[PDB]
Design a protein around this ligand. Sequence first.
Ligand code: F43
Ligand SMILES: C[C@@H](OP(=O)(O)O)[C@H](NC(=O)CCCCCCS)C(=O)O
Ligand SMILES: O=S(=O)(O)CCS
Ligand SMILES: O=S(=O)(O)CCS
Lengths: 436, 166, 545, 545, 248
Amino acid sequence: DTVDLYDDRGNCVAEEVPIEVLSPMRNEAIQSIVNDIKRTVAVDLEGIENALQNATVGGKGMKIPGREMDVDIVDNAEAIADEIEKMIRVYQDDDTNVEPMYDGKRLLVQLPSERVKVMADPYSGTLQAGMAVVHAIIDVCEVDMWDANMVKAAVFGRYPQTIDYFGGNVASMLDVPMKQEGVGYALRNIMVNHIVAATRKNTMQAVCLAATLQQTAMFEMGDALGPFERLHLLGYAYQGLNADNMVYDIVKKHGKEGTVGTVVREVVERALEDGVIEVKEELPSFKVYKANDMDLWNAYAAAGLVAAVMVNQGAARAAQGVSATILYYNDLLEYETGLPGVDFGRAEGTAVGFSFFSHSIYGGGGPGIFHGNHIVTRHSKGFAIPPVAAAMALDAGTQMFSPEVTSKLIGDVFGEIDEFREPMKYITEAAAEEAK
Amino acid sequence: ALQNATVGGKGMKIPGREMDVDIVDNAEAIADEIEKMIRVYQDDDTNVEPMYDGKRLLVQLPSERVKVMADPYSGTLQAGMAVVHAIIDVCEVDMWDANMVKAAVFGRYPQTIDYFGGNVASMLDVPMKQEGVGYALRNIMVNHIVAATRKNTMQAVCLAATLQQT
Amino acid sequence: LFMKALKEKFEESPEEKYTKFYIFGGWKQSERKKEFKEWADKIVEERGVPHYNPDIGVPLGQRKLMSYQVSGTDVFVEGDDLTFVNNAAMQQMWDDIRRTVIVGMDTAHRVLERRLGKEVTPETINEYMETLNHALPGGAVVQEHMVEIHPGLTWDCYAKIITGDLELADEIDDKFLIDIEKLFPEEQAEQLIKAIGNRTYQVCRMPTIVGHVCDGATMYRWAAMQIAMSFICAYKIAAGEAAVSDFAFASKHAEVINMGEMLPARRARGENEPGGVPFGVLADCVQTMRKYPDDPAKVALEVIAAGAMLYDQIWLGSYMSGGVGFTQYATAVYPDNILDDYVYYGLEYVEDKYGIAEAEPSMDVVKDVATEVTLYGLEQYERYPAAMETHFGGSQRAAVCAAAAGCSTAFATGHAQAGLNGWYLSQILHKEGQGRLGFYGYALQDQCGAANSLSVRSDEGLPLELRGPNYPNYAMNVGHLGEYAGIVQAAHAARGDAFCVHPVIKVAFADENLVFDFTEPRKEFAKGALREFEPAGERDLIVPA
Amino acid sequence: LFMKALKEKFEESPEEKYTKFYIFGGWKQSERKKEFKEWADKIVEERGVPHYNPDIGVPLGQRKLMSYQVSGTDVFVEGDDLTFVNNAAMQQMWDDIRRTVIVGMDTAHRVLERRLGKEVTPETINEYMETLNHALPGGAVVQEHMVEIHPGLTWDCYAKIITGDLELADEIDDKFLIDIEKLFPEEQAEQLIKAIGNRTYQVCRMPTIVGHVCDGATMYRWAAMQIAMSFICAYKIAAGEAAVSDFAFASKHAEVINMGEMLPARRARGENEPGGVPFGVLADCVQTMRKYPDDPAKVALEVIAAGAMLYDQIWLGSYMSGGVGFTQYATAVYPDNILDDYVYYGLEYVEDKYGIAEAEPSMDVVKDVATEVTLYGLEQYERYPAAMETHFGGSQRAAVCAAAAGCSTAFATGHAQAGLNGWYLSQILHKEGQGRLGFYGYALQDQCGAANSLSVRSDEGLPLELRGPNYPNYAMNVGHLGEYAGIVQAAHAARGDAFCVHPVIKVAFADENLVFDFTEPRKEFAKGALREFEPAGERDLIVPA
Amino acid sequence: FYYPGETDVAENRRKYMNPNYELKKLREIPDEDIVRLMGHREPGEEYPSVHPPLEEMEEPECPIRELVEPTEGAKAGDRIRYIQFTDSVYFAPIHPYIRARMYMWRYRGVDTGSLSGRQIIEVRERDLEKIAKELLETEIFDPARSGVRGATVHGHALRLDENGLMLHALRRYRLNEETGEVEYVKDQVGIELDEPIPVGAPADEDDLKERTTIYRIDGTPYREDEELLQVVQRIHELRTLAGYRPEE
Ligand code: F43
Ligand SMILES: C[C@@H](OP(=O)(O)O)[C@H](NC(=O)CCCCCCS)C(=O)O
Ligand SMILES: O=S(=O)(O)CCS
Ligand SMILES: O=S(=O)(O)CCS
């Protein structure tokens, strides 16, 4: 099985790519993104300064009166960075990278891959990188021994009393292992808004980043395995790596006048023309289509789902009805064909609860705050979250809880890293070389 | 578990859902299917060997699978899901009773947080049982430590110390 | 079956499509809602902050507000008397389950002999139970100057022994024994003894008041503590010695049994909480299989009643949300004998076409039984506009028809998973039939349903017996959970099984010293609806007159 | 201070080392323990399973069984009347904390305008609160045919507004406003307004009965649901529309405040449970800083009383263990004015040597103040064998002396961490003094204590304000937790602070519509001890006469 | 295709879904009275905006944005408002899930929710008023068996008023038998209007059945359409099978 791979502008960038080359354990770029996710941490130096300046530690309205402390963190960001790469480096010639950002308000700390390597907990890099910031502040800013515990709190919040770094000023794409809905859900517990912030509102690149993170958890959970490996390999090529230029071509032609229904019909025609599906039997007026290839049919429908969202929500410039699009793309697509929708029901399944929990009193929220680990959107095996990332990127500003409110730090610091911001070029390039 | 429909563990039995399959006798055939599903390259360190006359089974995943793994316990999902599939289409399990094999392997998961009443084990166990960030390599019983070093005192001390200090 | 109730609730013929509205007096047509304003008035007077107020927002009762015959009974009550907060029996059912922990006695007794050097005999075991029943409610056995708990608050706390070792069973004081042979029909009794084996257990029922102040994960810690105190007392070891830590670990982990297990971070909860309780286990708590072995429908219907109540009204409608809640989401499946009619007829169908529990599990049987009963149930709602007006939400309509369909498919096969697969066929039929299904996120489950039903993957595959409110699809939405328990019970009732998934939990809830009567949940609900049920845990002794 | 009580409890002079035993009639010397057998007898008669029985194991009362003057009062009661299960006030204190959730109103109101296009003004905000106080207790605002909850069961549920925006504050109905300027002394008021800022909050207090049937993590889900229902009603948007999901997310996560956060897997629990509540927060619940601003000792002593009670008796003694429990582990620090004497004298010492809150935090001050007060307290127990016989366990002896030492060191510095460091010096002094410290695992904390106190590492460093029963060292053992809260209060009382760690939680628990009186916890306990306290949540309306 | 089915109701279901099939007009309601029914704004006043127009915004470097044309309200930055319908089980021409399928075929930029007793569409404000007109004056609406309501939606599964109308707890519409027309006296949330808006002329039982989309025993029984019942059973089979094993 060989898919062609195209970029975010519809141009071809790799020829006959065997889909076996696209699995995380075969693909080098994906391998490295996982490494870069365990090692890359964002630290808010301005936020730690404010917290310490006003004794507002632990977060959420708290203030420890009489324990205020005027230290200058931002101004010494450079000096703090230097101490950090001292504590953190393993070899002189490794990939430790600790650079101040935004005039010293922010700080990217990337641990040496040597530290990753021997790390069980994927979030752990935050402890290591954060504890450096803690120590570096104490003996650059000359903090008193009796008030040092205030620096620990400005950095890590209420930890260990809370399960997480509550009210802290440390962040990564991952967050704490005990917040996981199940084994291997680590790479699933990354907000769509985080995804969209780090790809800087580039729709194709958001879809990609969501898809590769999703499908890498699909492999980790033993879902993409055995008689299912192919389902996710092809599902992944078409959804996230713009295989056959199918997502891009559908949107090029349906983008000016099209709806979710016309995109549905676009999917049925193309599978028809390619011998993916045929006519099983002809009822009294209407055709029941069969699948010649169940995995590639799913892959085809899945690609059209992303296109369905891009055309529909892109027309409104509002995220919102991504939940309706996913619901009704699969609803229509089934009763147009007599075949299962994407993910054999689960994709439409997710969108029913998603629609509910984005339009009611009981919970949820707006589209950007969901992720592969939200109980409302955990059900579909990688085929729903990448749509949701397209929608939240196509938003011109209708959301209260946008990437700028929830995912600011991530967007500012991770946005600066290239394989985070633009993972397509890297995965497809990796896939080319890997195929020799 | 499958012979007596005692799945989920802790005294449970689903009556009328008993199922006589022979797992142990086909341990060799099951292993072979497992290294098929699990291998990444022909020349990697996949190792899937039957132990104790087919009663037990060591499944070591290719380091290629580790490499891209966030959850440290996850190898159990991968290795276990292989055992699940390998039993179904070597022992010719009926589609409607296949969910019983999932339960014999992984217990009450996902209803329970862990593989409660399951028959899968590693030195690590599930991330949400951790007392804090990075406590993964800490959540290994002293008895596990001592069992694996076969009651050798110096080597137990060692294994405990290096896991602790790591 | 639903005609008598339909003619009591409605002036018109059940057949008529027309009636009058806006002519009932609004809010104040109802006895209950009047009572509520009276109390609100007295509250605000004494208090100074406004409370309940009819005139805020919506004027209830522009239609006639219904009474409901609790199915299987001849008691008609207002809907307001079936909210769990307004109903003591409903609260006491949950209380009895939450406060139940069962602990293995075998390795404990092994410790006493192999490590502490003390003989374990029936004579000492009885002595031990006299002690445990002093110690469990808060009595002192070892330390001088101990304060104690008022027995008047804890009159519902006690312990008994379950044992499949029949030779030990009739050496234990009858008052300390949950007798399997006395409590059960002959064949259910033998099926249970075989399933339990010569293993012996300690059933502890904590005080309800302790669940009121604390939570479910208190329950086993409390059981473990007093069990260890009683061992110390009865076998005269050191009151604090190495081997005592074996008692702590046997009781709390190695040989323990709780009605529920803990839940993940977003719905963070310890043990013995409603979401950790599996369908098969809730089904084995209900004791209707004991009294009506030859009516698979009553046993299942009765399991639905206390499933929907527990899982929708108390669990989803309070723990997971709160407010006014989900009374009638649950009631749609235990008032008015509507579901009862659908289920019984479905059984008459299976009884004819196939045998009871005689059908090979196959897509063919599901496709047949599921479709037949769903069309039947759909057709009853459009034949009787009265029943349509009773079950006004589609969610509860979908639930009533899918339950009937699901349990019916279980009646034929005797296999929960097949039955479940029929539920998911029924729903997707209802969809295209009325051009609707339920509320907004109603069909998340049911659209994932077909693929996950027989799947074997990670967080996808699992027999229905073993599933619960923590199974990913099932964790959010009403009109599903208790009905699934009904399908588990239906499968196992059709076969004549004594239990669905747990022998010991089954025997434990057969005990006549429980407060709720688990043989007849529906009749109990009406007892609570009429304010005739006497709950435990009330603090009227330690409070002014 | 402890003499009057020591002479009431003991016939002899407090000085005497000798007395008579074995001459009190055993068990039956005590009014309470007699009552308990009476009720046990009636229970077993009706029941058929033995219950409470004096004659099992140990014969209580071979020594005289003590009465206890609740410190600060003139009420003497048996120990049995201060078990939380026997005491309604103690249960109601926990109830009021567990059922409290505070929600930010700012982004919610922003949504209405920026997304839903509706104006938010004081007129609409008051209308909204009339609605919320109909909706919170279970009243219907939008859907027809809604069943409702009995106001008679929920007469303690309500909501009020906290706001540092003083211009909005006196535009809100006084009955909907927790007025910071009315409730607080002038300077505490201004310190609070400054700390809160122009941010406005929604204090919701759920029904106690709901905490009885459910748990703490119910509390906010319930708050969030009815808040969203009331917004829908009052601002006339679609009852189910996109921006409503902003309300769900603001109320449940982004702008929410709970008294406790969730706990890890081994002590798995959701929110608003006792172990998730930090020392500084429990301290800011108690309102004694309001009434006695110029007595740092009373404010701290009062925080110890409701800390030890909550954390030892209810939390550690039930949730985490159970049984007879840990009454007197807690009582050692609120009966008999024993700790009171030690604390006051320690303050007189600090008041002299240093100033109140005037000492630089240093090892020198700890070394001085800690050692002086620990030797004092140790020397009082060996001077008065009567007080030694009162506080018969070493754990409670260590706790009384370490609390006095710890709070005293806090009185000098005004810094919780310094104060805490003095606790850990005091303990290691007690050790070598009497050749003992407490029960077996008493000093796990106190031996880790010195190194973790000022440490800054992962699960080691954290100011005491921010610590709680989930701080690794602190999660297991009695005679520590509530005393730590006292040290947090001591530090902040010495400074004259209005709060220790949370402005909003402080104002919230100042409200006079709470059931428990949080200004005076000790006096309330005696009110519950004498069975004079009227709790909420009782179900006598829905139950036969 | 749209939708399988060999019966009349199935055909009305390809018709309303088909953007080629012209929806037969039964009424004529002026734009001012659509703005008043959806009481979001006053018809004279301009459009409120949730964000500034795209023609003057920092539009992100995105090659997908360039392919997809925004709608009128998107370019102006209009706020997203709604309209909600409740359709009676007694032969209402259009029904919730069928409404949403029509929307996803007919209109651009659609957010919609199909519930049992309510159906809501949410899009840009100016485009919503244009969509609402077609929904209100064509054969898809009927002022007796279909009601406009954004709150207290109770009534779809309820028996009919003496006048043949669906229950309205808030009494939004009234029957003016002087003209024989149904007219709204309140907006869709229940606030009293200044003057009644005649959307009237309720159809008789015969015309409704000829254009109904609900399967009913007293109309076209669900049991009758075997070709629909075969496709829905096919989706069930292939779902259960593929979820077990994709295939081969
Ligand atoms: C405001 C919402 C949005 C939301 O997230 N939840 C609501 C309201 C909420 C409130 C209504 C209480 C009140 O009136 O103040 C409560 C009781 C939850 C709570 N906070 O306690 C509830 N829904 Ni609702 N809700 C219900 C139902 C329904 C059905 C009613 C259809 C009809 O024709 O009447 C529809 C959904 C559907 O169409 O399927 C519905 C919608 C809605 N549901 C629409 C309001 C619809 C309206 O404007 O009238 N509920 C039901 O169908 C049965 C169960 C019933 C619940 C009460 C109970 O179980 O006793 C209640 C359960
Ligand atoms: C989704 C989730 O909510 P959040 O998105 O986390 O705010 C979850 N609520 C629920 O599942 C509520 C379910 C009961 C009410 C809806 C019944 S259909 C919870 O509170 O943990
Ligand atoms: O109207 S909703 O489906 O969102 C809630 C039903 S209670
Ligand atoms: O004796 S122990 O220290 O183990 C327990 C004291 S309650």
